[PDB]
Amino acid sequence: SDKIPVVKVKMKDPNKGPQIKQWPLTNEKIEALTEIVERLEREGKVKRADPNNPWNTPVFAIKKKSGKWRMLIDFRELNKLTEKLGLPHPAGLQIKKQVTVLDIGDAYFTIPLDPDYAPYTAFTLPRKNNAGPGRRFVWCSLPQGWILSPLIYQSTLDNIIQPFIRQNPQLDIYQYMDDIYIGSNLSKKEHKEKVEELRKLLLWPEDKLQEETWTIQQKQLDIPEQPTLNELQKLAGKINWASQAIPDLSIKALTNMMRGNQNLNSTRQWTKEARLEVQKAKKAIEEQVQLGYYDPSKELYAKLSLVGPHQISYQVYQKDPEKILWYGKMSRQKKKAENTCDIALRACYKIREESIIRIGKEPRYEIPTSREAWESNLINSPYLKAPPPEVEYIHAALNIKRALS
Amino acid sequence: QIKQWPLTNEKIEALTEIVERLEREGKVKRADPNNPWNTPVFAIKKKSGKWRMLIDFRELNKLTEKGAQLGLPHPAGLQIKKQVTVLDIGDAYFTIPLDPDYAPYTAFTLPRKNNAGPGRRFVWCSLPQGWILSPLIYQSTLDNIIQPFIRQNPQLDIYQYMDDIYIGSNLSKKEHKEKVEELRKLLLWWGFETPEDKLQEEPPYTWMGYELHPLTWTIQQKQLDIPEQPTLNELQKLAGKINWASQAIPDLSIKALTNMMRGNQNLNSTRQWTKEARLEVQKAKKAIEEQVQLGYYDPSKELYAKLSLVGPHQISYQVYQKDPEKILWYGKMSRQKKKAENTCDIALRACYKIREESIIRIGKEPRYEIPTSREAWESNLINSPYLKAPPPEVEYIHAALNIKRALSMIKDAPIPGAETWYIDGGRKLGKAAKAAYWTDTGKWQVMELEGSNQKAEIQALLLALKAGSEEMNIITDSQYVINIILQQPDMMEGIWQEVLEELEKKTAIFIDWVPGHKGIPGNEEVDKLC
């Protein structure tokens, strides 16, 4: 059940495609998964692969609430290597009274895919304990989580969708990977109404954010009244760190205010030149966070740190001129079991929603872990809601830990 | 691609007969005059028979374009069955015709009296030749032939490895036999014949170089033989046997023996035993002999992984079940010579490896038993978190040795009353580098040692401490040393080992960091090293 023009699609090199090995899956996940895939080869949305096909892409499954299982595909590697329109990111979306987000996903099943490119969408289905070779599969529908599907979808339903935006221009509509973002300032009633209308439009209201309650975290530089030598060496290192990207900061006056007996327990009394220099740095750092400094031509980054136990702090920011765009916490939550990698995943998803609502894109996530600890916490975990964040592995550095706290 | 190797005159007398006996039945033909490629043909004499002609095909198995059989089925993942059959699909590639547009790269020259004339070139037409690259032609087509039978019969446990099918069931002998005949029928209807003489059906089973018994499996082929003039063929067979035994036993390395394999890929050429890759082969030799036996997984029982500890640079573990104490498999996690890991961290890494293996083989995660107090685990390496960690929720056992907390550092609130130190090193003029320390009390000294700037900056450390009290405050301008200290290692290499070795003696250290080269009180005077 699909006939509509095939948006033809090209690799950045037909020779260089995704060769990624499949994750280990539980008994339960293989059961649910082979059920899903077998059904979708009945309906024709998937088909068996060519015996000389060298590509693969990982698949996994999650327990969508109600226990009904769901198949997700990690298209991270393929997405980089293809990139062959749109409905653009509305500036007003981030200042709407409410913004409902809706999964489409299913409509993709009704849309064909370029069969000269589908060979690269291949994914292996494994069996428990390698009892047989994996059963390989290439795609026939628009695959969910694919990079070029929001385009091929939006251009395929262009003729029915853009009517509904030129009418009702009080709504700000956007689409990221497979989710549609409906933002409005109407009352809860008529908002629910129009979102219902648009749901039945793509039949051819689950999650709802209110991005005002999103604070700014308002970083602070604590200044003790009766300091010790060590409290001021921390103070010094921290401000020397700030001066690497903030102009007109100095640690000289307090540098020689720290002169005397050199036991870390020795006190100092506050001079006036150093106390004022300290104040200059303090108000220089509080006001540092500025989203208005975003540069759409540079890469966007989000860096995480474990600021003591049970709590991740992150900064979404940009490089060569280091400009912090916003900050954020994510505290381990009480009842459920949770390791630090899980708080990092949760944080990554919170960053994902914020960044999509404001910039319209996702940052690169810089996480202080190893490829082995991460990527083993995801293969068999709960807390995994979406395709995994694309991750850069960084070394823990004390200046950044002290900065984000 | 490759040049036909020298071949003993009494091998072609007996290999031309196999090649001629093969072009007669048609499995080969003559290549083309223009066929530029080649592959060597070797001849080994199987004990008490005729000469088995074995072709390499290792070179071209890379230019014959790629594909994508995701590991091995592990016999501990089989469960105990009242009835077991092992079908062998003989006629492996032997009659099954081969793609003619890939058929040219099949070329192999053959000697007459080793160049009494020019070489007789041949090309494999009918068979894929019993080569190694059956998994392409074999596994995914067999899998789709028998997958309907698999879905039809959930009461059976089927396992397809290269040319063995394994069928395990709890039906009676008669119903089981009938079903095995059902699948044999299905196989013949698609071309795959199962000869009655290679069937197993009987008390011990050969299966991927394992031996399956009712309660127990073990490594096939209970004796490793070390030849004193090792040709590379015999060596490769030794690496295969070792790799099979490596699924049951841990800690069996192939690396010095694979290093001992090198260029001159002739499988009747030889090597000479390097010293390390004889100790590997002898260690594996005694491990394999005096056999071990392991169990099958019991889905009706809790699964366990127990970490045991001896030596500070290795964590051993067993995946096993309880109340007969059935052991499913063993494994090791070794220390990293460069990294700043302590033993808690090696335990964590072992948990990662176990989680992977268990999920592949069993389909679930075991309960983790580790020898440590809840204190030395919840605090160490999950609450002193340089970098982050995915532990499970865990059962702590008390064993012969346990994992203890890393170090004696007291993080918050630098120690009241002990004298602060300051310390620095490096500043390479030329070869000359130095190291030194100063304290709030007058004490001070310079070392003026050899090394690099980094080793000079750690060698700076250990001299505040060798010359220090039992309590301390160290402050340094090195991000390297402060970083390692924040990972909390409990054993390292080199001079770092000695600094770790002085942290033995002391009761309370507090180390901290301040920016170097900003003229900070304390750092500045110790910078005077040049």
Numbering used by the authors:
A (entry chain B): 2 to 85, 91 to 210, 216 to 223, 237 to 429
B (entry chain A): 20 to 87, 90 to 551
Direct quotes from the study:
Reverse transcriptase (RT) is the most common target for anti-AIDS drugs being the enzyme that catalyzes the central step in the HIV-1 replication cycle converting the viral RNA genome into DNA for subsequent integration into the host genome. RT is a heterodimeric protein of two subunits, p51 and p66, encoded by the p66 template and, therefore, identical in sequence except for lacking the C-terminal RNase-H domain in p51 as a result of proteolytic processing. The structure of p51 is rigid and provides structural support to the more flexible p66 subunit that undergoes functionally crucial conformational rearrangements. FIV closely parallels HIV-1 in its replication and pathogenicity however is resistant to all non-nucleoside inhibitors of HIV-1 RT.
To elucidate the mechanisms employed by fRT and promote our general understanding of NNRTI-resistance, we determined the 2.94 Å crystal structure of fRT. The fRT NNBP structure is conserved with HIV-1 with variances around the NNBP of fRT making no global change to the pocket size or shape. Intriguingly, a group of FIV variances clusters at the rim of the NNBP entryway. fRT is altered to K101Q, D192N, D177Q and V179D in the p66 subunit, and E28N, T139G, E138A, I135K and S134R, in the p51. Structural analysis suggests that variances at the fRT entryway could render a rigid pocket with a more of a “closed” conformation that could inhibit NNRTI binding. The bulkier side chain of S134Rp51 may further contribute to a tighter entryway by filling more space at the p51/p66 interface and interacting (3.6 Å) with the carbonyl oxygen of I180. fRT also forms three additional bonds around the entryway: one salt bridge (K173R/T39Ep51) and two hydrogen bonds (K166N/K49Rp51, and backbone amine of Q182 with carbonyl oxygen of E138Ap51). FIV variances, especially at the p51 loop (S134R, I135K, E138A and T139G), have also altered the electrostatic properties around the entryway from negative to positive charges, which may interfere with initial drug channeling into the entrance and subsequent penetration and binding.
